[PDB]
Paper text:
In order to resolve the interactions between the BED domains and DNA, we performed multi-body 3D refinement on the three best 3D classes (regardless of the oligomerization state of the transposase) using masks to divide the transpososome into three bodies. There are also two DNA-bound BED domains (in green) that have been contributed by the B dimer. The two LE-DNAs are antiparallel, with each TIR interacting with a different Hermes dimer next to the 3’-end of the other oligonucleotide. Furthermore, the STR2 motifs are also bound in the hexameric Hermes transpososome where only one equatorial dimer is present at the position of dimer B. Therefore, we conclude that the equatorial Hermes dimer B engages both its BED domains with the STR2 motifs. STR4 was not bound by any BED domain; rather, the 3’-end of each oligonucleotide (bp 36–47) was positioned similarly as the TIR entering the catalytic domain of the A2 or C2 protomer, with bp 47 sitting at the place of the TIR bp 3.
The Hermes DNA transposon is a member of the eukaryotic hAT superfamily, and its transposase forms a ring-shaped tetramer of dimers. The Hermes transposase is composed of 612 amino acids and is organized in four domains. Architecturally, the Hermes transposase is unusual as it spontaneously forms a ring-shaped tetramer of dimers. All hAT transposases are predicted to contain an N-terminal BED zinc-finger domain organized around a conserved CCHH or CCHC motif that coordinates Zn2+13, but no structural information is available for Hermes as the constructs used in previous structural work lacked the first 78 amino acids.
Residue numbers in the entry:
A (entry chain G): 78 to 383
B (entry chain E): 4 to 460, 517 to 609
The structure:
Amino acid sequence: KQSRELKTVSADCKKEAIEKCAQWVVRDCRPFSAVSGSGFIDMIKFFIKVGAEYGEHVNVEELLPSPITLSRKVTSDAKEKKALISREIKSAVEKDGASATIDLWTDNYIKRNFLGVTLHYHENNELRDLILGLKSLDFERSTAENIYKKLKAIFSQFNVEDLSSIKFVTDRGANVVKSLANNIRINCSSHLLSNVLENSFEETPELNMPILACKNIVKYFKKANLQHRLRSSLKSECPTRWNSTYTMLRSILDNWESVIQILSEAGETQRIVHINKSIIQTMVNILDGFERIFKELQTCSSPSLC
Amino acid sequence: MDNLEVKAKINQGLYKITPRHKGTSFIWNVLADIQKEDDTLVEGWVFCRKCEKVLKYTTRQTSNLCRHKCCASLKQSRELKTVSADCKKEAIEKCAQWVVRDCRPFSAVSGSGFIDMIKFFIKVGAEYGEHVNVEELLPSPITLSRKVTSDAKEKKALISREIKSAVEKDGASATIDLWTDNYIKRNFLGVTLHYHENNELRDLILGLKSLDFERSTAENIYKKLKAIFSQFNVEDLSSIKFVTDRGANVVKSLANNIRINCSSHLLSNVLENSFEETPELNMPILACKNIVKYFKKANLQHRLRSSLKSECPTRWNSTYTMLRSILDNWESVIQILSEAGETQRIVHINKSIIQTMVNILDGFERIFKELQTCSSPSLCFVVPSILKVKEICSPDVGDVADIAKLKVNIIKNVRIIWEENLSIWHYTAFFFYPPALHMQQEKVAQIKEFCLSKMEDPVCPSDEFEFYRKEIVILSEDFKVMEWWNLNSKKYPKLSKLALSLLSIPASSAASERTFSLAGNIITEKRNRIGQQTVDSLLFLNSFYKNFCK
DNA sequence: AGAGAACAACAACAAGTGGCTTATTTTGATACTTATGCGCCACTTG
DNA sequence: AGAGAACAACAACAAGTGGCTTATTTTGATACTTATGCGCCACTTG
DNA sequence: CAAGTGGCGCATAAGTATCAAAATAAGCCACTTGTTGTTGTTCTCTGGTTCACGC
DNA sequence: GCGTGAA
Ligand SMILES: [Zn+2]
């Protein structure tokens, strides 16, 4: 028990420590998992070190800065770290090995347009990934020329002048297509397969009718607050998110007994019984195969091109 | 040289002095400057108050001025032992890693609880050296939840005695409300409590318990509130003053007890009725609504210099700030509409009516702000609100006849909505105003026997009531009624408790709105599995720390 | 061839001052870049 | 396809009083050698 | 006379010893409340809004 | 010109 190593404390210290932690958590309205932060324990290390080395009569308030200082410091560190890393960035991109995915996104509240850039490349027995930056296209309407200028500006402030050897795996955005016509443009496999599935469903209206029935049933569930007695609540109807209807099918067919029991006295049981379960499990298995394909192929931490 | 010249002139007395500069540093608490004979400040040089030597002044830097011998001795108040610049550098560095690695807001470091934690941690580190294992010291969130629940239980047990002590003296003002969350569709029941013990009202929440998922009904509300009061072992449940506006099932449940309407939502409904009866002013508001939607649909908000406000969240008439934002930047928006091809929309609206409506609705906003105050008592200034809204809506020739129609609608709605729904308790509260020269009508006639009957539970009550009737002092700008009868409590030992109870009744029930907003802050899209017990415990602890602690 | 004890004529030495060129620090006003800090001021959000 | 956040359900647990036989140090005491001065006091000498 | 020593024990004492009857901790186990810990489950987040444009 | 879609 504490064989002369990094020392422990008594029970009073633990009690008062958790008292202080509870005080902070309840008073400042922060998430509970804060005390498990990776940087939080490092800050605790620094503070206990400083306190031990400088006694217990120091001005705690003065040692802690203001948020504006934090912003200036993080900006300065951003500039310094970018300058430090640009050398290895140019070294890696010079050797024809540099792969980057490009896609734009619109902000939810202010709707400012942005563009993000990352990099996938192999340093030493591993594929190193770091995001290069994320710059906004002001407020002007999006165009291929602006995207091309912004990307060359980012690569240039990171000391890149080739813009030919690097690789892109992106969408079929015609503006993006004309943006980088001098290099390769590879269609996103996930997006291609999503289009394939959309075409697959849309050519069979007879079997699309069960999908409409199921989505209107989950609408009936969410509209009347009927997920309360259900053992496992249902998910979103149609978010256009890589066949969320697959999860809908799994949930519906795992609570089929409960939903039929509920709808027997609800008067809508005639609608569900129109479709037999066998075809439903068959397409569930097909979507199981497709979901396995998704989870194996869609991976940024291991090779998947093979 | 210039300095010798100005020194000689000021010593001869040709130039005068100015000792204070309104600066945040301590150097100007001793240092001073000079002004010329034509009331012009001296630039580039300063003057000391003890050595009487003219030193240089620099706008870009003042460090050279603090090493002077006269200002050296003053320094500043002794502080706890400080460290060098390096330690601060590594401190801000580690704080930068903390704030970047956990996606946390920057203003987290300035929290009071964080300061308490760092004080504790620096103390324990100084006590037990530099080799203490930190990972065992920091607990896990499950322990945090268990301990906060237990602490909520024990704090409630401790305070229930003083809730009883407050309720026995008939001070039992507390409002209830219902609200729906955003993601679980659960319905939560919220209730606060107000009482006076230590010369200001105590704002705290009794609790917030969820009524499961079963269908809303009067019996569920009554049993829920009965249980909530039962955790404090309270069975009176009759002298509690209720403030709910138009909750139909809620009113039906508590119809046996004392019920009082809510003034804020009443006034909002009065404004709604007033604007409903004038279509000529109804369609310009709709035109402004469509104009705002036109900007918002195609994110045309970038061009404008001051973006428009939210349309109408049913959150106390946001159309005020909506029309303010529209009016105060009219030229730019009408230009944008000019090249937008939708120029026909603006023809229906004129600026003068906009500005007059801005004036009157800003008056209504001021009324809202004055009446809605949780900390200070606010029940007294209610009838003067009706008087002021009456006098502002004076039918004149300056306004258009349509504005006269709107004013007539306001007066009709306030006459047939507000005063007929006003309880005698509001009259009693208005009566205690120290200058009572305006009212000598039947209201005092009724309040006489009302107060005499209520206070049943030499030293004659009627005689001291007329003694209060004679004493009259006009209002001062910094006057408070509560401390006024705190001083007069010796003069009237029994009526003081009655007036304290009356002044403990809030004008409205905005406390429930504040609690619901706080709960919405607690429950976010990213935190949704949180339980009702934890929410209630957190809210109770926050309210207790804000109210009853230091 | 010891040994013990004490003057004597010189005689080779220090403790305690001034004179002094010639450096040898200390006190002090001031010309700048450069990393912190309140405080309105929003201000856009729902 | 990671992203944070958080319960419920069952294992798991150090923190604390009470029996207690087995080492073993404090105090105590009798018991006995070495050696260390204090003062008469002769006990001399010149 | 007086500065020097033995002497007569000589009353004292800082040393040593061993013979008893007590004052303590160590290793284990009792056992009863309260108390902390992984390891599961369950609900959202990003996939997306009109322009390059050829067909 | 208007899908044309692939976002
Ligand atoms: Zn001075």
